[PDB]
Short mmCIF file of C-alpha atoms and ligand atoms in Angstrom, two decimals:
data_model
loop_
_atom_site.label_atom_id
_atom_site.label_comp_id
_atom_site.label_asym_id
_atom_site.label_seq_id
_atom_site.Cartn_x
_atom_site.Cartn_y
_atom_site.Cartn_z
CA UNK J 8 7.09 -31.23 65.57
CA UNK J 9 10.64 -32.80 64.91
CA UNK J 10 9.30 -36.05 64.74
CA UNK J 11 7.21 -34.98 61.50
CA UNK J 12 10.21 -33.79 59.97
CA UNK J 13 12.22 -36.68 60.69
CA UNK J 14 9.33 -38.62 59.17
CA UNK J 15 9.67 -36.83 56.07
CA UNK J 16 13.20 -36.97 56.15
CA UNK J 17 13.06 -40.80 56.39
CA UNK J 18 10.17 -41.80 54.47
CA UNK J 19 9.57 -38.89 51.88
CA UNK J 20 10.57 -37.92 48.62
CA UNK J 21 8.63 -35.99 46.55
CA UNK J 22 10.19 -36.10 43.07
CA UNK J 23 12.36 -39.17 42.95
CA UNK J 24 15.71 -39.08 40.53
CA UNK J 25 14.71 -42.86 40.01
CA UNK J 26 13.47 -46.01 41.40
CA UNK J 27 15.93 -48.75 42.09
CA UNK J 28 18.70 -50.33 44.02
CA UNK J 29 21.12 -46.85 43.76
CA UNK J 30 18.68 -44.86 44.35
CA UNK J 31 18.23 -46.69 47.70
CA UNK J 32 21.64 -47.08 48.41
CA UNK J 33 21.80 -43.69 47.58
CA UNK J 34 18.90 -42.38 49.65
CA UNK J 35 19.49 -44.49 53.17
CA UNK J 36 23.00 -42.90 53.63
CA UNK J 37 21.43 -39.29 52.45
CA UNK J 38 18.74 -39.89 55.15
CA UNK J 39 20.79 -41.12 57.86
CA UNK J 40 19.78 -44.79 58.02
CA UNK J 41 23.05 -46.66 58.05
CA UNK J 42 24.57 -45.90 61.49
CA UNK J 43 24.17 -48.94 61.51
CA UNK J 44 22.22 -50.32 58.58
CA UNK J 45 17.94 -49.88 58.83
CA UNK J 46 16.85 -53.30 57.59
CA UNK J 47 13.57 -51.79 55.49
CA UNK J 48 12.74 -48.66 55.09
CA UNK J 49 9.24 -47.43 52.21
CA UNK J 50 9.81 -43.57 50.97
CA UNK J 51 6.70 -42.31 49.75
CA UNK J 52 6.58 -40.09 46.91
CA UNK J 53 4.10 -37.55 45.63
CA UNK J 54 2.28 -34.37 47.27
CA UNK J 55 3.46 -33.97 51.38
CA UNK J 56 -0.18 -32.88 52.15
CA UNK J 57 -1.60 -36.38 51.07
CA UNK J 58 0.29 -37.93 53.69
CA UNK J 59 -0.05 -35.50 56.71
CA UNK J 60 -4.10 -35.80 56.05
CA UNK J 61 -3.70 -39.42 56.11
CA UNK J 62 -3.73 -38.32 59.98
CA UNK J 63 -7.33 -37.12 58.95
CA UNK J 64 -9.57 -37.05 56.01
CA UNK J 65 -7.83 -39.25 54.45
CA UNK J 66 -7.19 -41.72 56.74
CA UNK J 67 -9.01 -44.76 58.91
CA UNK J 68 -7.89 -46.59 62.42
CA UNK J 69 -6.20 -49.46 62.27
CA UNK J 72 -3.41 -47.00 67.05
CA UNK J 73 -2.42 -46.26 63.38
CA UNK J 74 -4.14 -45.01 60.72
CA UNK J 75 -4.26 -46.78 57.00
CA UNK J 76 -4.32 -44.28 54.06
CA UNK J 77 -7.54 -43.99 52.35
CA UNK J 78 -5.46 -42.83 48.80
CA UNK J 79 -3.06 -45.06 47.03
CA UNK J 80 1.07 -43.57 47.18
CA UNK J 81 3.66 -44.11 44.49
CA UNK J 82 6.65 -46.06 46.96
CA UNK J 83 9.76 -47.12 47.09
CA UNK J 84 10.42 -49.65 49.73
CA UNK J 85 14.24 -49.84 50.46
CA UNK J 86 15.28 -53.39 52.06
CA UNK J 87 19.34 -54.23 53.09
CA UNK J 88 21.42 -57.22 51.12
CA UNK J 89 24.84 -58.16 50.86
CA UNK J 90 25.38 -59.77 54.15
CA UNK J 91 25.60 -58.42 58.13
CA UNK J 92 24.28 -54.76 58.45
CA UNK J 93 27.26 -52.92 58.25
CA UNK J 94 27.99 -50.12 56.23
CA UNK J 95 28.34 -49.46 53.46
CA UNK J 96 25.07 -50.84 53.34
CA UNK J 97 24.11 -52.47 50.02
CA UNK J 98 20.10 -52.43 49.38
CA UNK J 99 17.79 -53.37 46.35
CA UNK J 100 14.15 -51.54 45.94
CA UNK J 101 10.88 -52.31 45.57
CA UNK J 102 8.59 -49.36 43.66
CA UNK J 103 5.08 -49.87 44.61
CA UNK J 104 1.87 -48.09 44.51
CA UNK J 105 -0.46 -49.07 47.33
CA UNK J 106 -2.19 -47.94 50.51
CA UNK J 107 0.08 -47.29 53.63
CA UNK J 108 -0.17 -47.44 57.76
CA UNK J 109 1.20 -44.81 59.26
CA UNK J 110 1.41 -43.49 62.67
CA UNK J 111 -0.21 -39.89 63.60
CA UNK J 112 0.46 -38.13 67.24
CA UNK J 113 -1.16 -34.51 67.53
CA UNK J 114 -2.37 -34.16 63.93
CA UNK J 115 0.87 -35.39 62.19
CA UNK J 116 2.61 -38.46 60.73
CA UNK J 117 5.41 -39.83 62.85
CA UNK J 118 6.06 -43.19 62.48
CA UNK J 119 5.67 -45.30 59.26
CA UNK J 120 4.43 -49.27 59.62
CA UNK J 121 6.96 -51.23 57.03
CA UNK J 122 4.80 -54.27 58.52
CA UNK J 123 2.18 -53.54 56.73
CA UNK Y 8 31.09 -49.25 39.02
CA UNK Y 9 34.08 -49.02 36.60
CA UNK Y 10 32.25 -48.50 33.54
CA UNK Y 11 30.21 -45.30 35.38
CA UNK Y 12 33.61 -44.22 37.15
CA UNK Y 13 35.47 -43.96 33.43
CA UNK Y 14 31.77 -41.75 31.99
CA UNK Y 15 32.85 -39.26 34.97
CA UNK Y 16 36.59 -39.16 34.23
CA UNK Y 17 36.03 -39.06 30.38
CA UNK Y 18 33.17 -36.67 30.16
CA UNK Y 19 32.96 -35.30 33.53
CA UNK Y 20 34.16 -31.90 34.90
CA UNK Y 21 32.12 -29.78 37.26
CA UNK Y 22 33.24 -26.25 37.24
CA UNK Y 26 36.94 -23.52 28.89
CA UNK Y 27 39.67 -23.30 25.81
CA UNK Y 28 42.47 -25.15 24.01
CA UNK Y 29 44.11 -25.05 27.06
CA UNK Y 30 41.89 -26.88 29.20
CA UNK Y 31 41.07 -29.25 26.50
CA UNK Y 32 45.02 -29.73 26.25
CA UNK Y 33 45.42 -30.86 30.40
CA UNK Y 34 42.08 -32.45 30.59
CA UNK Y 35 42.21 -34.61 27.61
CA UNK Y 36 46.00 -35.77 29.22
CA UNK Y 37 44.57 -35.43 33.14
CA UNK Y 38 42.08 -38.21 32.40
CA UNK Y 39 43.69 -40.26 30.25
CA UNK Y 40 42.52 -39.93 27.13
CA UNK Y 41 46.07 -38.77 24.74
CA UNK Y 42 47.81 -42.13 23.84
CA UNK Y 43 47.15 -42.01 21.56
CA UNK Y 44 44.94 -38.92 20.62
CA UNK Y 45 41.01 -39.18 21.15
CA UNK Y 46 40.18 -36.68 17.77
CA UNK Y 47 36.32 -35.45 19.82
CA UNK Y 48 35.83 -35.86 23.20
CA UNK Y 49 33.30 -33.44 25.48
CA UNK Y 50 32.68 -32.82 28.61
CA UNK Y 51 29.90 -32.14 30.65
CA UNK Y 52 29.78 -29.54 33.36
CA UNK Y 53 27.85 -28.83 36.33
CA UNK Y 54 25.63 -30.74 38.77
CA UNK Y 55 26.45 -34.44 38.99
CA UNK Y 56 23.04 -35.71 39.63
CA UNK Y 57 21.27 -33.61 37.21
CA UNK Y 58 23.55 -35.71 34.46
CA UNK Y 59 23.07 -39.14 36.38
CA UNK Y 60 19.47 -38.48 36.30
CA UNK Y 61 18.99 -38.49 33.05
CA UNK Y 62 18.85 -42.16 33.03
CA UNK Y 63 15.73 -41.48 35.23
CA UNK Y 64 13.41 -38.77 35.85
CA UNK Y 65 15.82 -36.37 33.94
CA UNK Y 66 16.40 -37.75 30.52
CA UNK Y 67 13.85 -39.85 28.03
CA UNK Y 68 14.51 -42.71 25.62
CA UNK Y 69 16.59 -42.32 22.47
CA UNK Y 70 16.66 -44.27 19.31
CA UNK Y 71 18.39 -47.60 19.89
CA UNK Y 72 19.00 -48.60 23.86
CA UNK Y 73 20.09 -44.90 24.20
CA UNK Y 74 18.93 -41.70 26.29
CA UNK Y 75 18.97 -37.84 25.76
CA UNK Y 76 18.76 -35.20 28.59
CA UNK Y 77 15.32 -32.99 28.83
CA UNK Y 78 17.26 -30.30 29.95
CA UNK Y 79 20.78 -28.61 28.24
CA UNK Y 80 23.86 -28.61 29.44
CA UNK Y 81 26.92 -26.24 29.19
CA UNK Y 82 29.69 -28.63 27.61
CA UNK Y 83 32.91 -27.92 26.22
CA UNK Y 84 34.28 -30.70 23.28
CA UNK Y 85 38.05 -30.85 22.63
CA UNK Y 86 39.10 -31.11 19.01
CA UNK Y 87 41.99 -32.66 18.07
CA UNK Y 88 44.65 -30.13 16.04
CA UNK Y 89 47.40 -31.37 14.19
CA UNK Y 90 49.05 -34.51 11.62
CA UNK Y 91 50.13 -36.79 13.90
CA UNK Y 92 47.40 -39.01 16.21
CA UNK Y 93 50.30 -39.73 19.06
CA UNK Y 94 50.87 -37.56 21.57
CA UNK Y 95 51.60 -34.62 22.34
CA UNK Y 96 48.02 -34.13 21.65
CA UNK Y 97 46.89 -30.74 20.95
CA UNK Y 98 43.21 -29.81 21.32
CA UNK Y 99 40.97 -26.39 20.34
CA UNK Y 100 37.77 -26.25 22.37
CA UNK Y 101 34.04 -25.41 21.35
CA UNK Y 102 32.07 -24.15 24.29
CA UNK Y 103 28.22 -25.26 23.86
CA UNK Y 104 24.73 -25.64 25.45
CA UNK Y 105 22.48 -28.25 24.28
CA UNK Y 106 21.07 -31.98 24.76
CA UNK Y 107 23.01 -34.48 25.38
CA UNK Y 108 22.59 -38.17 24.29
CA UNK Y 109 24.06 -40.97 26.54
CA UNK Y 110 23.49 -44.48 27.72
CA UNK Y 111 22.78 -46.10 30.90
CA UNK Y 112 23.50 -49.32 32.40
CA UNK Y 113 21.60 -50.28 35.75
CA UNK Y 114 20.38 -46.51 36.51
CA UNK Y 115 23.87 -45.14 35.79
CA UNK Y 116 25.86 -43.28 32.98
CA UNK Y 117 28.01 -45.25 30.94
CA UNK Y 118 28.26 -43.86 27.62
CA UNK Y 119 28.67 -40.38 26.17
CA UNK Y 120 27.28 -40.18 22.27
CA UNK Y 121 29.93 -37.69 20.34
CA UNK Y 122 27.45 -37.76 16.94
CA UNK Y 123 24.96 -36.35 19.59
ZN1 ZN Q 201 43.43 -34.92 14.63
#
């Protein structure tokens, strides 16, 4: 499923360099956010499996499904101005539960909502 | 970020004698007059920025030192005079490096190490 790996290409990273506002700015050009500029955007961190079974085991409804494990984060969210690039961006590390949405057994959307 | 932008140019070079010490010390700036010790780093960019994360730990005073070596190459100044022309012998090494870091970012390169 390409819509699994472009989840994981827009909300994971496993072993984050750091935490802050570069690594953002860094990160939403690197993952193809800022044609034009995504608004808010969480990468979760840690062990891939923990998310895809959030589609099972460890997950509960919600049609999304809310982790039932806590995820190191880092929620990405646009500054500077109107949303053109180069798009500016401070972070917000967090460590909390997270919504996703799972089609056929896999993640493929994540719920910044929430 | 000018005072990142100057770490890269001053202690910065990707892909290792007197010679290179003698053009890279006067590519980027640093012969008038003569810097006496100045090294750079090679290799991978973001392994080096990363030590002011994941890749590097904290060191003595508002300071931070790599977890992993790097190949480096620091030019010593030869001769009397400290104006230019600045002539330079080079010692090719592998170890730890010690820097600082202002907002995630390199900023400072520690020659006493
Ligand atoms: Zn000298």
């Amino acid at each position: 499923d390409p819509r699994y790996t472009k989840f994981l290409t827009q909300h994971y990273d496993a072993k984050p360099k750091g935490r802050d506002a570069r690594y953002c700015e860094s990160m939403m050009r690197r993952r193809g956010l800022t044609s034009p500029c995504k608004e808010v955007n969480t990468f979760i961190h840690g062990n891939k499996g923990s998310i895809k079974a959030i589609c099972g085991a460890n997950g509960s409804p919600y049609n999304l499904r809310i982790s039932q494990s806590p995820f190191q984060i880092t929620t990405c969210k646009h500054t500077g101005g109107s949303p053109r690039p180069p798009c500016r961006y401070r972070a917000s590390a967090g460590f909390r539960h997270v919504v996703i949405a799972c089609e056929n057994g896999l993640p493929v959307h994540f719920d910044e909502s929430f």
